[PDB]
Amino acid sequence: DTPAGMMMKFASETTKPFVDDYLLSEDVRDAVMHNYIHIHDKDYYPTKSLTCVQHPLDVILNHGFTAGHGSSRPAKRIETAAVLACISLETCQNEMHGGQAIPAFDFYLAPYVRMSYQEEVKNLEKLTGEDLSNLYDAPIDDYIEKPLDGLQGRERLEQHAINKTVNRVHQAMEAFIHNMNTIHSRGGNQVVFSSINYGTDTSAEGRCIMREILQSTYQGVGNGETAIFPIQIWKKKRGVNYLPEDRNYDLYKLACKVTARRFFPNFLNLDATFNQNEKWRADDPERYKWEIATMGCRTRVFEDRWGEKTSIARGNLSFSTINIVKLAIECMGIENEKQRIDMFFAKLDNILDITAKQLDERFQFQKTAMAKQFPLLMKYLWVGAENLKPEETIESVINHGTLGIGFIGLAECLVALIGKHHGESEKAQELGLKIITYMRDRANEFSEQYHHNYSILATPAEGLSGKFTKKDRKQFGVIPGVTDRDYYTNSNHVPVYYKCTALKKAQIEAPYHDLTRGGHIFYVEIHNPSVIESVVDMMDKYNMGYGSVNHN
Amino acid sequence: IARKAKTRDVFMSIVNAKNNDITRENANMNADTPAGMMMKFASETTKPFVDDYLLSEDVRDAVMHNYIHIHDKDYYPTKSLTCVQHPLDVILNHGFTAGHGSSRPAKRIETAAVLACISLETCQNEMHGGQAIPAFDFYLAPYVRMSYQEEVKNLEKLTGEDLSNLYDAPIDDYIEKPLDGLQGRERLEQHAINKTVNRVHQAMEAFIHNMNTIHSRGGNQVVFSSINYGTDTSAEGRCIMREILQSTYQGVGNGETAIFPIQIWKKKRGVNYLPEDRNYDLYKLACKVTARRFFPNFLNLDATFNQNEKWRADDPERYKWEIATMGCRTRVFEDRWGEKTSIARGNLSFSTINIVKLAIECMGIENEKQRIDMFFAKLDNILDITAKQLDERFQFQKTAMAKQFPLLMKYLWVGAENLKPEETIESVINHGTLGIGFIGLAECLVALIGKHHGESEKAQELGLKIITYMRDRANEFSEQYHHNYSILATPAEGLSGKFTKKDRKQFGVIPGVTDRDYYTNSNHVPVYYKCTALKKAQIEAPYHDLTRGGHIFYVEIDGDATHNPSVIESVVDMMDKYNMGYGSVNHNRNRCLDCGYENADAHLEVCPKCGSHHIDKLQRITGYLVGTTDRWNSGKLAELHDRVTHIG
Numbered sequence A: 001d002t003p004a005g006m007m008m009k010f011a012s013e014t015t016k017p018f019v020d021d022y023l024l025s026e027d028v029r030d031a032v033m034h035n036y037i038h039i040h041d042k043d044y045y046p047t048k049s050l051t052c053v054q055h056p057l058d059v060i061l062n063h064g065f066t067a068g069h070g071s072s073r074p075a076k077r078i079e080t081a082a083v084l085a086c087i088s089l090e091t092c093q094n095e096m097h098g099g100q101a102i103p104a105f106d107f108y109l110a111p112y113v114r115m116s117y118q119e120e121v122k123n124l125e126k127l128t129g130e131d132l133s134n135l136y137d138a139p140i141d142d143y144i145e146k147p148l149d150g151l152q153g154r155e156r157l158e159q160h161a162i163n164k165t166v167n168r169v170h171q172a173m174e175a176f177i178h179n180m181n182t183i184h185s186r187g188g189n190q191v192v193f194s195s196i197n198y199g200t201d202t203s204a205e206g207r208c209i210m211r212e213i214l215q216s217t218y219q220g221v222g223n224g225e226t227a228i229f230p231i232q233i234w235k236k237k238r239g240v241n242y243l244p245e246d247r248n249y250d251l252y253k254l255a256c257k258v259t260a261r262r263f264f265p266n267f268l269n270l271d272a273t274f275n276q277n278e279k280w281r282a283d284d285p286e287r288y289k290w291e292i293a294t295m296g297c298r299t300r301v302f303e304d305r306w307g308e309k310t311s312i313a314r315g316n317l318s319f320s321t322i323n324i325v326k327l328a329i330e331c332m333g334i335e336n337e338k339q340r341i342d343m344f345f346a347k348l349d350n351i352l353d354i355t356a357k358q359l360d361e362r363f364q365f366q367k368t369a370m371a372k373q374f375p376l377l378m379k380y381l382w383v384g385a386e387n388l389k390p391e392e393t394i395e396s397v398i399n400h401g402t403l404g405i406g407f408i409g410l411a412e413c414l415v416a417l418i419g420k421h422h423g424e425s426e427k428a429q430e431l432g433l434k435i436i437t438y439m440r441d442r443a444n445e446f447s448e449q450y451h452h453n454y455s456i457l458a459t460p461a462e463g464l465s466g467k468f469t470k471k472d473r474k475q476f477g478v479i480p481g482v483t484d485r486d487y488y489t490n491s492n493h494v495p496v497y498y499k500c501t502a503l504k505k506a507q508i509e510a511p512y513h514d515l516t517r518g519g520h521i522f523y524v525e526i527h528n529p530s531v532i533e534s535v536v537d538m539m540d541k542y543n544m545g546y547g548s549v550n551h552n
Numbered sequence B: 001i002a003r004k005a006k007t008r009d010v011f012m013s014i015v016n017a018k019n020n021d022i023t024r025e026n027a028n029m030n031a032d033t034p035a036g037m038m039m040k041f042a043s044e045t046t047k048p049f050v051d052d053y054l055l056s057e058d059v060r061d062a063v064m065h066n067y068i069h070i071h072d073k074d075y076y077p078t079k080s081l082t083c084v085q086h087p088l089d090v091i092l093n094h095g096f097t098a099g100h101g102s103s104r105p106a107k108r109i110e111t112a113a114v115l116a117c118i119s120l121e122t123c124q125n126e127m128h129g130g131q132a133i134p135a136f137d138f139y140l141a142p143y144v145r146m147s148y149q150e151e152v153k154n155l156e157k158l159t160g161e162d163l164s165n166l167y168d169a170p171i172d173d174y175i176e177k178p179l180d181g182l183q184g185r186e187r188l189e190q191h192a193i194n195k196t197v198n199r200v201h202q203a204m205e206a207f208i209h210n211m212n213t214i215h216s217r218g219g220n221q222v223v224f225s226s227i228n229y230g231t232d233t234s235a236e237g238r239c240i241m242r243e244i245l246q247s248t249y250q251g252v253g254n255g256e257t258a259i260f261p262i263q264i265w266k267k268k269r270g271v272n273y274l275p276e277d278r279n280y281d282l283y284k285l286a287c288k289v290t291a292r293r294f295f296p297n298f299l300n301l302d303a304t305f306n307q308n309e310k311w312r313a314d315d316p317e318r319y320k321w322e323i324a325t326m327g328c329r330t331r332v333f334e335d336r337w338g339e340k341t342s343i344a345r346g347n348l349s350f351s352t353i354n355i356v357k358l359a360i361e362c363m364g365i366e367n368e369k370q371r372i373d374m375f376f377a378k379l380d381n382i383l384d385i386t387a388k389q390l391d392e393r394f395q396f397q398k399t400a401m402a403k404q405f406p407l408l409m410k411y412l413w414v415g416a417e418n419l420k421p422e423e424t425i426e427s428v429i430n431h432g433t434l435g436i437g438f439i440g441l442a443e444c445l446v447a448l449i450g451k452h453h454g455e456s457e458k459a460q461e462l463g464l465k466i467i468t469y470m471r472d473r474a475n476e477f478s479e480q481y482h483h484n485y486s487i488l489a490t491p492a493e494g495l496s497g498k499f500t501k502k503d504r505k506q507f508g509v510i511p512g513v514t515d516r517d518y519y520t521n522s523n524h525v526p527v528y529y530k531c532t533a534l535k536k537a538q539i540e541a542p543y544h545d546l547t548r549g550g551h552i553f554y555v556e557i558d559g560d561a562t563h564n565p566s567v568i569e570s571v572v573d574m575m576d577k578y579n580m581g582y583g584s585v586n587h588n589r590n591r592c593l594d595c596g597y598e599n600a601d602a603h604l605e606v607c608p609k610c611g612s613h614h615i616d617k618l619q620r621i622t623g624y625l626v627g628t629t630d631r632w633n634s635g636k637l638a639e640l641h642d643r644v645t646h647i648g
């Protein structure tokens, strides 16, 4: 409705009918035209843009960043460090069509908590004059606060100096939450996606910054208002937290209390046998670079078939969703069950072949793009973008991305077309695991022949919640139990209308997580912080992954 | 087939990152980025839509025959206003809610400088022009004293006294005095003054660094911002001015020039101009920065058309009757149904009128008296069409929902705090001004009849008559359509080199009329003709009074005069002697893509620090500042390569 918002749809409605006939081959055109394959984010097809990336902020903060004609200096304070983090999330958004996230936010804001107070003792000293050159190289327990009830001594300056950074850190983090919640900079939707990760830092500086993050979030933004960004993620690796005899167990009790109030902080299971790495040293500082860090878009980039297994600076190239619900309708006329399942696999075989080539054609289109089109994404943020001339091509470093073959309505696929769905049916549970394994096995075959990184993704319900259903419903009238819901259920998720307990959902949805390596989420909808620990307790027994709790 | 055989090659040209296919119309945009490409696709769709579905046939025939040009035709269906002024007082003392966020009133200087950047960024996405902030020094003054109250209460808890008497302590100045060689309370009270000097310096540092950075990016319309200051006498007020000057004079990043914001210094006699005046010392410093960073600009408050009769020194300088200038050269000072103030108001629309083609049409007649009578007859008819065109565009912008302009129609527009989101903005839109422009007056008919005005001859009488004829006619339309028309010297960025090519095709290469390509800027002496600064001032001075809708006295000063602060002062005195209102000094700087260093040399190829060969030219265009000569238009690059400098 805004002048900037209405300008974007003029370009979209112009460039969307253009790409259909002048960029696609005849076979993919018919498959796309016949409502079989969906191309996510087709508006930016000519621009040759990528999906997302995990922001490395340690490099940006230590040297600043110069995008366009705007330049900045390295941060030397808590206020300067937090504010520059927001800008790094604002410039890159205009160069992509997805979202941003901060991996291990705790580690980044920790030297400057000390450094803002390290030189503060030199300003609190000149009033007195005594050479107090010992307030930095000492083991601080928690950067604690006191009621200031008649403190007295020479070392009263030592307690006053540390008292100066706790208030300043609290003020510093208020800027970060407000900046990412009120600055409308993106074209169109006018909101920049963001996400941060914290919960696995135990140092004195890290414990202070993590507490204030929870303390500031407990208060809100402006006047007692829950923030929408950034999305909060909590780590629960065993041996650092989640155990009573742990250094960070005290904050974990507070974190569940904050979650009970604002419902913002999500949890990530670092013990899943696929969210697990062999290079986690307990003593090496900055425990990131070998951990799992997700986003708000259920995007998971962990294992690379050519490179290193990490989630830093990587992301998706582009992903397409395959309508498997439609294929079952065409095979509903076969009387013999063995023949019926034979046809569905044959029909699924043809669509999968086109989609692998369909993603391959868009990949070839994107590799010709120049690095000058992404001033910040292809300069500091991407994996191998530190050496890329503006006039070069992205074909060298574009391979460290994920092409996603997603699906929708697995429950809708089997609810009435083939018997029952994967809820109150053990036979359908075996059938459902067979199909996803069939897609997973084919994606392995596509990876060998097309030489890419194909993964099965649980596509978030955003932009494709009702598009598929309406088009197919008209073609096939009213199919009872399938095309009478106006929305297809999300990937490998128990349908909402099927009543079940949290324990039962954990058991049913656990096996799918090892299959959908491209992204998954566990959703629990429902005061006491303990009940939050119940979710991670059941997530502990069964190998699951990313988890979230909502109220609505 | 041509409707789908050349429209396909247009999109391909955009996709392949070409250099000439209308992708270099605007220098503030980066067309090689995904954000830039989407804007190009949308602009190339609506402009054909406007021609055959929006404007009438009489105006259309002028457009296709290259008679009347419209400005910002891309945003025509969006119903977007041009510019506005920002009363920062409302947002810094009560708080504001933008989108799903909110805020509370600022308590120190760090949380007050950051709220000003938010309003400028937010309001840009609702208009297609610039943004301005008047009385900048006055608005930030109270919170420096509020910073003094918080630090005292902080000292009270750490000490335990009753320092209520220090809440309104009459201290002489906020200048920092180091605590060396003193004892007792000199290390207990002087500290509270040296503490807050560094606090104010950082806040002004953040404000500047949050205005150039946002302009370097952006998926929406690029951010165009400006501020005004100069006439504050309070101790807190002088503190704001002295920090903003030092912050600007220091620079963004690695000591590089800030493209934005635009800064203007306000000159008045008896407040800052005379040596006896209090702010004379800061007055001298402003000339030091504008010679080195091309800011602040100088606006004369003593001009006859800039004087105000509701200004009293007993009040705190009454920062409401001081004229302020928005981005480029737009000014909104007079009003027939409102106060003579430039607070929370701006421009609506403006169009340029082609006059060179009218005279070359009549060049076949050998009777001088006959030509002029027919020339006036054509001009009267053409001006009638343009007055309709601005009014016709005016009728389109009236019916815009206030919810389409959230920040503009809630805090920043005059009397806009009384309208609900679903209401129409027509009840308060009339405070804007409609501009009628012209181009190539020097080569309109004077360069056809002998020589143009300003060529050391007496031909200015005819040139003055033509502009005055429009000036009288502009007033006639004001009394006719019940609007407020004002003639403005139209900037030449994209329209420089558009009319000329069609006339050459239709008529041919004729010296004076054509073969000059870019054409001379409105009311200005031929940029290819030599003149002194004083003589150029004398010829163009009477035009400033005739164009009460925007004007600028541009002086091209060589690099050697940058180091001398007297040349800027002489120009201001030269502006004072005559009735010139707005003037600026331009100069060519050189940028570096690695270090970012700028120097004042005539031409640079390798950066002294790094050694890179990507040394671009940092120069000024008719309305703003930008580098990256790879974004200088073909018509404008011709005008740039023929500019004449004035040593004085």
Ligand SMILES: Nc1nc2c(ncn2[C@H]2C[C@H](O)[C@@H](COP(=O)(O)OP(=O)(O)OP(=O)(O)O)O2)c(=O)[nH]1
Pocket (backbone or CB within 6 Å): A083, A171, A174, A175, A176, A178, A179, A182, A221, A222, B102, B103, B104, B105, B106, B107, B108, B110, B111, B114, B118
């Ligand atoms: N968007 C944005 N908001 C900021 C920034 N820094 C501070 N704020 C917000 C936080 C609050 O909503 C507001 C005022 O913060 P203050 O620390 O001055 O506190 P205030 O005096 O409102 O409340 P208090 O007396 O401390 O309870 O400014 C920033 O960099 N960006």
Ligand SMILES: Nc1nc2c(ncn2[C@H]2C[C@H](O)[C@@H](COP(=O)(O)OP(=O)(O)OP(=O)(O)O)O2)c(=O)[nH]1
Pocket (backbone or CB within 6 Å): A071, A072, A073, A074, A075, A076, A077, A080, A083, A084, A087, B114, B205, B206, B209, B210, B211, B213, B252, B253
């Ligand atoms: N765009 C933008 N830049 C900011 C903002 N706040 C601060 N900056 C810039 C100002 C500086 O370029 C940088 C912070 O500089 P510091 O305060 O760390 O000091 P600097 O490195 O200049 O050294 P110094 O303290 O002068 O010795 O970040 C903001 O809100 N937006």
Ligand SMILES: Nc1ncnc2c1ncn2[C@@H]1O[C@H](COP(=O)(O)OP(=O)(O)OP(=O)(O)O)[C@@H](O)[C@H]1O
Pocket (backbone or CB within 6 Å): B026, B028, B029, B070, B071, B072, B073, B128, B129, B130, B221, B222, B223, B224, B327, B328, B329, B490, B491, B492, B493, B494, B495, B496, B622, B623, B624
């Ligand atoms: N990025 C920008 N965002 C907002 N306003 C801008 C921007 N760039 C320029 N402007 C405004 O637009 C004005 C340009 O008017 P000008 O007379 O130079 O137009 P032009 O180059 O002939 O073309 P047109 O009016 O078609 O864009 C500038 O003086 C300034 O006020």
Ligand SMILES: [Mg+2]
Pocket (backbone or CB within 6 Å): B107
């Ligand atoms: Mg506070």
Ligand SMILES: [Mg+2]
Pocket (backbone or CB within 6 Å): B202
């Ligand atoms: Mg500093």
Ligand SMILES: [Zn+2]
Pocket (backbone or CB within 6 Å): B592, B593, B594, B595, B596, B597, B607, B608, B609, B610, B611, B612
């Ligand atoms: Zn250099």
